[PDB]
Amino acid sequence: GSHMARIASALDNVSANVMIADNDLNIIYMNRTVSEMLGRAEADIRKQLPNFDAGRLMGANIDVFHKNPAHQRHLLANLTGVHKAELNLGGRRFSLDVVPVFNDANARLGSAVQWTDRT
């Protein structure tokens, strides 16, 4: 019944770091490699985001990590295909692959995001 849960379970143990957000940009799943990766990156990320806490991402909204929350919400709300954003956080480089997820009626369910730590 839940497509997001099916995708999360299938991807839980793959190499690719994958985080899944719902339509409100709440983080609802993180696979094992992404949790581990963000744990390692935590020190560096704090230099720019001092209150960032990797152990507390599940159930957090991504707003809090965005200067202008209205911008990402509009972009993300309107995605028809993959969006490749590139972030520099505290000296660390990340490529994000943002993948819009739909049901069989074309109704948007949320976003699957691949993280790649380029550094």
Added chain:
Amino acid sequence: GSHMARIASALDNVSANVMIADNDLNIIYMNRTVSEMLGRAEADIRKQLPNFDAGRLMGANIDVFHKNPAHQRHLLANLTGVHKAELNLGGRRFSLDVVPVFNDANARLGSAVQWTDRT
């Protein structure tokens, strides 16, 4: 359906190198990064598989690259969760994350494989 076509399309442009095989172990989709990655690794892979051609992988059966094709077929047909294999090809190391793909009725459709070139 087609669930595989949806998956292939959603992943066509992600960073993760992804290849998709059907129930008969025919390669039916390759995303962009996996094609490029296998193109770069072609010379080395030829040292061990002299007839390997990265440009001719689409539609090929993977039997041809396996010493005991019956082994992989049995293994793959029976997967319920991710299978993590490690390959050495012409001195190159690859991690494969093999993800069994099911429809919402639990009927197996094929296999999505993430490739990572560890070298």
